[PDB]
Amino acid sequence: SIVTVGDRNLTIDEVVNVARHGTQVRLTDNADVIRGVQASCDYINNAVETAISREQAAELQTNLIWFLKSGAGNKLSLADVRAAMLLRANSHLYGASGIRLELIQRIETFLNAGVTPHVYEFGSIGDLVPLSYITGALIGLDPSFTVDFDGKEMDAVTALSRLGLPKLQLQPKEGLAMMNGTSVMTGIAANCVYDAKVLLALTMGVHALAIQGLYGTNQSFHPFIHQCKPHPGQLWTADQMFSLLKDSSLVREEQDRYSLRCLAQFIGPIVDGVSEITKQIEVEMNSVTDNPLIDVENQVSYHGGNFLGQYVGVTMDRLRYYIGLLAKHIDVQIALLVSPEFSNGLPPSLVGNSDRKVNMGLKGLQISGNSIMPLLSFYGNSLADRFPTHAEQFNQNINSQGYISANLTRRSVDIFQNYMAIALMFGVQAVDLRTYKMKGHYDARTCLSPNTVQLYTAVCEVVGKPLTSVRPYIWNDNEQCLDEHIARISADIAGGGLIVQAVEHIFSSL
Amino acid sequence: SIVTVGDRNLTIDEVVNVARHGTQVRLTDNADVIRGVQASCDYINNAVETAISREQAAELQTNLIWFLKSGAGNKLSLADVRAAMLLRANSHLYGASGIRLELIQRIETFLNAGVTPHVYEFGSIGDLVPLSYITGALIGLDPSFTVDFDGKEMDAVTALSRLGLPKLQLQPKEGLAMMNGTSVMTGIAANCVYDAKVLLALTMGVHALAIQGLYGTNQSFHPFIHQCKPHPGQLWTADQMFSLLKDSSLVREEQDRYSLRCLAQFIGPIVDGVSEITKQIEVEMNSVTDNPLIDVENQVSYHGGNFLGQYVGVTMDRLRYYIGLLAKHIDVQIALLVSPEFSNGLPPSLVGNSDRKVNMGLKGLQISGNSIMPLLSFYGNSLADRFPTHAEQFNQNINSQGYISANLTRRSVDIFQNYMAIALMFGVQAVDLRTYKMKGHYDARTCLSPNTVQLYTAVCEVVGKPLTSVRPYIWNDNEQCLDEHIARISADIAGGGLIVQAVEHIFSSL
Amino acid sequence: SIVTVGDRNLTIDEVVNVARHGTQVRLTDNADVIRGVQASCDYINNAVETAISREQAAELQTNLIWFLKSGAGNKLSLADVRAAMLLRANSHLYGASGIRLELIQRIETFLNAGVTPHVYEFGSIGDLVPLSYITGALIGLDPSFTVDFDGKEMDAVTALSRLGLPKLQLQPKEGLAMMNGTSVMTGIAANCVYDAKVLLALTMGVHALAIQGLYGTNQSFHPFIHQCKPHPGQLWTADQMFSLLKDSSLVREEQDRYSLRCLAQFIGPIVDGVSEITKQIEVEMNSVTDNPLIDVENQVSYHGGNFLGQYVGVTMDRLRYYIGLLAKHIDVQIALLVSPEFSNGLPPSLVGNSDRKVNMGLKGLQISGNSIMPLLSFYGNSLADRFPTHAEQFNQNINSQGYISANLTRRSVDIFQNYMAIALMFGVQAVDLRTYKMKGHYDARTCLSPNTVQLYTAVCEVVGKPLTSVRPYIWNDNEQCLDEHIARISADIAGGGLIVQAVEHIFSSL
Amino acid sequence: SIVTVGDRNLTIDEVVNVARHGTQVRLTDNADVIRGVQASCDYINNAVETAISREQAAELQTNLIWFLKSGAGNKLSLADVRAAMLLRANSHLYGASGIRLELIQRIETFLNAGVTPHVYEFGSIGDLVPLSYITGALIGLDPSFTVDFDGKEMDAVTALSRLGLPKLQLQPKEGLAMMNGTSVMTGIAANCVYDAKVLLALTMGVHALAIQGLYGTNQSFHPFIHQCKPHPGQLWTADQMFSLLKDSSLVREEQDRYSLRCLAQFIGPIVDGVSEITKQIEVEMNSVTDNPLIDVENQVSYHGGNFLGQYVGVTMDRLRYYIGLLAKHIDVQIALLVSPEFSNGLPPSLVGNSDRKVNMGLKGLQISGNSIMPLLSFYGNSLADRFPTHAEQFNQNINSQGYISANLTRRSVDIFQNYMAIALMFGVQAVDLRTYKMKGHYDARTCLSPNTVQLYTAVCEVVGKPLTSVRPYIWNDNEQCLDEHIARISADIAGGGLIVQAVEHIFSSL
């Protein structure tokens, strides 16, 4: 279980493990590659032989880090910064950046040692400033550059000491090679896409539970229908729903509102949009974005702009927009569930113990989700279109906004993780109460389709509610703190717990 | 030059010709197909044999048209309605709608006779109401249904007479088959995508002219750069720019602002997004969207929801968003052009006759474009996320907003056609004044790259300005009405004139 | 009935009559005023005596009109242009613009003669270009300047002839005095505020009808409640609702959803916001916005920027935002009406003739309103925040977007006029069907509160439905074209017909 | 220095001191008032005498707190919760809520003891859930209710013990009286308005510095101009600018871009909008919002909806929108400053030590502000228009979104505090470098207008830069961490430090 950079193109899943799970990294030993990295550096070195002095050109690279140390706001997540580093390294491996393998290694060291430089959320228009923080740390330039050494705050100089590493001095091109690029916004992005694909799957699971709690038909997902409107996204969603409801006893076998009957058609564009995004982010992830680019094969460098993260800004905008759609569609399901007029017989607000009259059930939980869903649509607004044309002395008359747009999508995913918790809770309670209305007991497992049983049980495990035919998930209002179950399911989903593993089969289907 | 429906899947280009150019239509004679259409109808007929009475079930289909005649607002464009019809027909040809070939023909007749039923812009949430207007006309149900008979307003009953056609009476399933679907929003959509691909190409041409008026380098578009960040969209744009500047004398051969240096990276996502859209719209265009769907092969019908135009609403949202991006990027180019501080030597506001001191040049034309560009970004806001959850007695708790979203994108394309006119004007004046600064004469053709020469001359032809080395496009302020040239270039672009033909080579490159 | 400019500050109502109703204008004869206008001109004249030559400074003023003739897009409404003119005149009357009374009169002449110069919708960033069109026409500068002479298209030169007027030649400062300002966007604005105040009142009437069709209580509007939360807007709305329901038999006397119980609290901010706007627009309307400003009293001119219509852009943004709120609140009322589960006994979709089973009632009309309401919220997005910082050679690094923002609010009002028609229709049908459920007959007038009776009857008059206890407004689906009634009620509301007069008592209450 | 609730209406400034500064509270001793509170309770008590049992009606009030404990997301700020409490109390003092003075006192105790119940950011649609957390804590209902006892986390039961308080049991109406209202969103709101008025003033100070760094004229702010366009907001801004530049040597005495020449006209609507808001928030702050309302004077209760915080949701929306405008206008100033072409002679990017060639100056600081400003406009989007119509079993078909909208405005203010820090830094450096260009030394105090001198020095004090004519604020790039100065100035502004006191004279002018 070790990730090797340089040989094969990195995938989103690779970046996540290394960033989130602490996985180990190893730079390929391929001579071809190492020779390309060394070849690009000599080109720069040879450029100093002919003719801008080595000493002046190195001071320039170093003073660069200094005026760029103007980040503000909260700090990025340690996983976001780790992913950025991984991508920076991966980039310099194509050997067109003219950077010292020794530096391409300083990263491998920090990554495997658990050192993560601190980075602010504000500072990039789409990643000079942010990368200037990562760089300053790597080379131990000064104590003002703080980092996170496996748990506590240290300064870069102290970290290098403890790593038995010697501060470094930026060479001719190395500053631009380090701080010119889209590695941080693209790293923040890879993490969002991942999380998004997860929530998506869970989303699919939540509707599955909902449809069973509503006793809706499965006819809506018959292939013929979707083979007449062959959008690959719709095709995929209908199919995954047909299977998720396989051998179900809570679903009628063969009237249903559009949130159920048009589910595939609705989810379709989002499923397709999310794959498009993924594919585009992977390409950014394996691109060379510093400047200028060294073409060793023709002994010449070019001055272009692969440092504009347009794909990340546009891509993250869309993603927040799909999140907002997913959530509003879910909120509509809950709406039907809580209403006796539309839930097809379920108790109002999925109340559990009708015996006690004070019980209100999940009415408070719905209001809570009613306050989150709009916010998600609010975050569905774009930012790439609001770029400042006067930026950086008018030289950056166009910019991507990729960095903040990425951070915005991270704020959405986080909120949507909370939202999913609330949804999961509604579906677990619904299938229990549906089971009881049909069989007389609250053991949903005896009637749920096998595919949704895994998710069902995964959630009860996480909240700490023990499967029993004598009682449903929520019985009385005074018997639990709903807020605790929200936080627990959130943390689970965020850490990749049992609930996530439960949707493993859907996330890989994409 | 005749379009045949039923045999091969329709393409955007096919729908445009038939809708915009009046091209002729012909339903394939393939027995397999015709048999499928007849087979689906017998299934319905046989359903009345067993068991809801023929007379009651036909009155139902007819009363359907009546309560649905509640459209409001302005009328759709005759081409939008023609495209809708074409798509309706094309749909019933898969033979899963259980509709009479005689009706699938009533369309072919209207299309080839130049009859276009009137349709309101308001009425669909994503196309019952709109299709109810097309239907009512086809069958001559009543005089209240007005149409456009090759030039003037007639009523449907009169139109059928003059066509020697007999009013028709809706059979069992035929109402739903006609009025249940996404043909109108998908028809409005196909027309936008088309126009968008055109404006895009022109956009590429306008930057080409701009870059030459600015004497910018072509190094920014060298393949190496873009092969290090291989986004297919970026790859395509850089390449098309490298060629568009081929053998140019106004461009320096090898500092440039980002609007020039990052042009490919910026345009990239938009070029890729627009192809994704196109592909998705073509799939909607060749889908069966009425309901229920008749599966003759297994003698059974299904009740689903391929009538949700989610792909059209999501797709059109994105498109308006790309239009807004394109335009704001263009406005930034103009900005550099008009400013002596950034234009690299050009006269302020591209004034022509410096001799006369009252001349202000294109300063008024820039302010005009400055008022349009923001509006385009404003239209870049979405609508698919604002769908009403309480719609149609709460049964349509989810809807696409495809119809209005489509109309919104039509309003954008229209405005952006005006905007492009203003841009083209700026680039024509710029290259003339750049030529004079370098050569001493105003004959840009002697220095423009061959690829941009075609577009260059196409615009001068349209505005009526005669190529001469003794004077530039705009000389004095009192010698022309800029508003006239805007309208002329707009109309040209909208009708597919010389200017469009000039970008033929770029539109087909996609 | 004659409006006199110069003596008292113009009010919105004054501008509307003159613009919409063709009312006559008369410049006050107050010597003080006329002396101020003449005094400001001598200051300019005297500035040429001392020292920029009279001939050169007049050519400048004239060439100004020429490069500014670059408008694009559709044409403004004749009433919008008439209001602009009225405001231009009114402005030059404070006598700080240094303009010839003869010109301040050329307007009075065009206004009273029914001459309206043509003006494009695109061209201003917030009104040089637009005013350049009005100016060019006034002085008959050239035939390219078209106008509207009481019915048909004439050119300015021909219009001046027929008016027995002599083309004029712009003096020293007169160009800037004419074309520098916020008269056109502020004129478009005054017309919107007006219309908005109307729709608002009607809105109040529509809820009144709705509440009675729903048999809701009037207790929600008891003063105590609103005197505990004394927002003047809420106070006003509750009160106007208490009265609008006075002596009603369809309302229960003393459970209700929030759309009824929180109506005042909801409408409150909108009522207050709309008054704030009005007040702010009136102040723009009576301001001097050309530049520079001549201070005759201290013999000195100042160079400032009262030409930034920030209040109009900000104000119109808000207004579209309030329109979107109003409409979405209305759509929620309709939702309850159409649903038997929430309408309190009404037939589903307010169907009229239950005898006939094919009848679906207003189900198609609701879907139509369901497609308009979202669009209104879509138009609720802002534009003032999207101003281009690079505009006009970077000199207008800040601008109001007032002009387009104004046009956008005009597009909203227009659509919302259509929407109100659909709402009015729902409430008329609802009270009829409520009456029948309570009394056994369909004569709502026998039970409606006197205040809503006027509006009720005003709508039936407009659609052409005759009051009878034997039948409701909509009986069968095949007996009328709902689209016709929408258009008729719209036109009525837009022209200020019977329906508007019916809400006279509410519009003046503000 | 003690705040007394009940006698006079609370003002924003009152709520801030108590919430932010820990000020002491004291309930008035006015017999009239206390009698009104006691009178409303007897009405409820007497309602149990006649007739729903005391025991059942108290269990209901208690079970209410339980199902409402479903908050999610991060926790509100201790000051936001303190303000909410203060407002809750203040409300029950009008004596129309039928609540026990003993409870109205439990707040006074928590406020003065420094106890602050924990509250989640998610849960209200506009404040049942949030207030349910405050309530549960007050009465020590259970340990799950955590609080903040002067520094560390305790549970409510433990807090009541240490306060020598006896858990309480909710009486007949008391639950609704506590948890039905707009105190939390209105408390979060009062804090934002305050902060906003502060940033505004500072904004005025930052332009003052900017205008002097640019050597712009003060003529733009001459009263005549603004007395011709008498918008009270514009009038106020011009005046405050005329004074802020009083006796200045860095400003030319009498060409300027619009960001300077139209500053008053631009800022005007924002200044007026912010006062409107303030006034509206104060009215919410002193309103009774629980339900039903007890009218002791007529012995009757009413069921209405003063619990809809429409004014807060609408008001906060606008405020974020004004923040976005302010910031984008500021960013445009900085743009001019950093550019030698537009700064009127200043060094590019306000570099300090031109001797050293590696120095880049504030170029990195501008890019940082370039990434924040767009985000602020992004937050300028609304939320009140996106309310969910299906909320709470369709009973809350309309809602304000006040709570989240309030939280959103809090996120804006926070970011804008960071932004202002970056702006202040630019203006301090600019006036130093302007002084040197004019006088030969870097002691700006010798030339700055007295009014801006206070702010100037307040910022240098905060960053720790000592006034000296031998060096400017930023000399070399390697001599300071710009990020440190951003954070320091932010914290200062947020805590109300020297910098804020420096604008005291402007904040009170409103």
Side-chain angles (χ1 to χ4, degrees), chain C residues 94 96 128 182 217 219-220 222 224-234 255-273 276 279-281 283-284 286-289 291 293-296 300-311 313-315 317-318 321-322 324-325 328-329 332-333 336 342 377 380-389 392-400, chain D residues 94 96 128 182 217 219-220 222 224-234 255-273 276 279-281 283-284 286-289 291 293-296 300-311 313-315 317-318 321-322 324-325 328-329 332-333 336 342 377 380-389 392-400:
Chain C
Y94 288 103
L128 290 169
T182 72
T217 181
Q219 165 170 56
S220 318
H222 192 248
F224 184 60
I225 307 178
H226 310 284
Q227 183 64 53
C228 302
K229 187 160 165 173
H231 280 298
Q234 181 177 152
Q255 192 147 351
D256 294 5
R257 318 267 162 183
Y258 286 24
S259 57
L260 299 192
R261 178 144 56 106
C262 304
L263 176 145
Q265 294 85 330
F266 187 84
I267 296 284
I270 303 177
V271 169
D272 278 338
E276 197 58 44
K279 176 186 308 168
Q280 302 180 322
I281 289 297
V283 182
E284 271 289 306
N286 300 300
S287 298
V288 180
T289 60
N291 189 75
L293 296 178
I294 315 306
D295 179 0
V296 297
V300 60
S301 53
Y302 312 81
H303 209 64
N306 276 357
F307 50 66
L308 183 69
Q310 195 62 195
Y311 274 90
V314 164
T315 284
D317 272 345
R318 298 171 57 178
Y321 167 89
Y322 296 134
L325 286 173
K328 183 169 178 176
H329 174 195
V332 164
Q333 294 296 48
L336 298 176
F342 305 112
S377 300
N381 271 297
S382 60
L383 184 73
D385 47 309
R386 291 170 179 290
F387 68 97
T389 59
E392 197 261 294
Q393 258 179 297
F394 302 95
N395 302 296
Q396 294 189 35
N397 50 345
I398 68 171
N399 45 77
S400 74
Chain D
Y94 288 103
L128 290 169
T182 72
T217 181
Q219 165 170 56
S220 318
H222 192 248
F224 184 60
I225 307 178
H226 310 284
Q227 183 64 53
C228 302
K229 187 160 165 173
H231 280 298
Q234 181 177 152
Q255 192 147 351
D256 294 5
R257 318 267 162 183
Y258 286 24
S259 57
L260 299 192
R261 178 144 56 106
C262 304
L263 176 145
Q265 294 85 330
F266 187 84
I267 296 284
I270 303 177
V271 169
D272 278 338
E276 197 58 44
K279 176 186 308 168
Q280 302 180 322
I281 289 297
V283 182
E284 271 289 306
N286 300 300
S287 298
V288 180
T289 60
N291 189 75
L293 296 178
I294 315 306
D295 179 0
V296 297
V300 60
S301 53
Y302 312 81
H303 209 64
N306 276 357
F307 50 66
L308 183 69
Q310 195 62 195
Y311 274 90
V314 164
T315 284
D317 272 345
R318 298 171 57 178
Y321 167 89
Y322 296 134
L325 286 173
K328 183 169 178 176
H329 174 195
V332 164
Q333 294 296 48
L336 298 176
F342 305 112
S377 300
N381 271 297
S382 60
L383 184 73
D385 47 309
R386 291 170 179 290
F387 68 97
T389 59
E392 197 261 294
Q393 258 179 297
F394 302 95
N395 302 296
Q396 294 189 35
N397 50 345
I398 68 171
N399 45 77
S400 74

Side-chain angles (χ1 to χ4, degrees), chain D residues 431-477:
Chain D
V431 294
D432 277 15
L433 300 180
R434 170 62 48 177
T435 293
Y436 178 69
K437 181 182 171 64
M438 292 191 206
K439 309 302 189 183
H441 67 78
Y442 302 95
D443 190 67
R445 297 175 298 169
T446 307
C447 317
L448 284 184
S449 53
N451 289 63
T452 55
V453 176
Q454 291 161 38
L455 175 59
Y456 174 78
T457 47
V459 171
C460 308
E461 202 162 324
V462 177
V463 285
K465 291 301 182 177
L467 304 161
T468 60
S469 67
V470 309
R471 295 285 196 286
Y473 163 42
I474 305 293
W475 188 230
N476 287 308
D477 298 356

Side-chain angles (χ1 to χ4, degrees), chain A residues 380-400:
Chain A
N381 271 297
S382 60
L383 184 73
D385 47 309
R386 291 170 179 290
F387 68 97
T389 59
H390 57 270
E392 197 261 294
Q393 258 179 297
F394 302 95
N395 302 296
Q396 294 189 35
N397 50 345
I398 68 171
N399 45 77
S400 74

Side-chain angles (χ1 to χ4, degrees), chain C residues 232-269:
Chain C
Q234 181 177 152
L235 276 171
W236 178 94
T237 298
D239 180 289
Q240 291 285 128
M241 191 53 61
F242 189 82
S243 294
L244 270 160
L245 294 173
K246 184 172 66 109
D247 289 318
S248 180
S249 296
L250 304 182
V251 50
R252 63 180 195 275
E253 300 278 359
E254 305 191 58
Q255 192 147 351
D256 294 5
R257 318 267 162 183
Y258 286 24
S259 57
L260 299 192
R261 178 144 56 106
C262 304
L263 176 145
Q265 294 85 330
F266 187 84
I267 296 284

Side-chain angles (χ1 to χ4, degrees), chain B residues 204-218 221 241-252 256 260 333 337 343-344 346 427 430-435 438 444-453 455-456:
Chain B
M204 284 298 280
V206 159
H207 283 300
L209 292 188
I211 301 186
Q212 295 181 71
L214 289 165
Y215 182 64
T217 181
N218 54 2
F221 311 99
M241 191 53 61
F242 189 82
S243 294
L244 270 160
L245 294 173
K246 184 172 66 109
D247 289 318
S248 180
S249 296
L250 304 182
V251 50
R252 63 180 195 275
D256 294 5
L260 299 192
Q333 294 296 48
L337 288 179
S343 74
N344 280 302
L346 296 179
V431 294
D432 277 15
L433 300 180
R434 170 62 48 177
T435 293
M438 292 191 206
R445 297 175 298 169
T446 307
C447 317
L448 284 184
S449 53
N451 289 63
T452 55
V453 176
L455 175 59
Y456 174 78

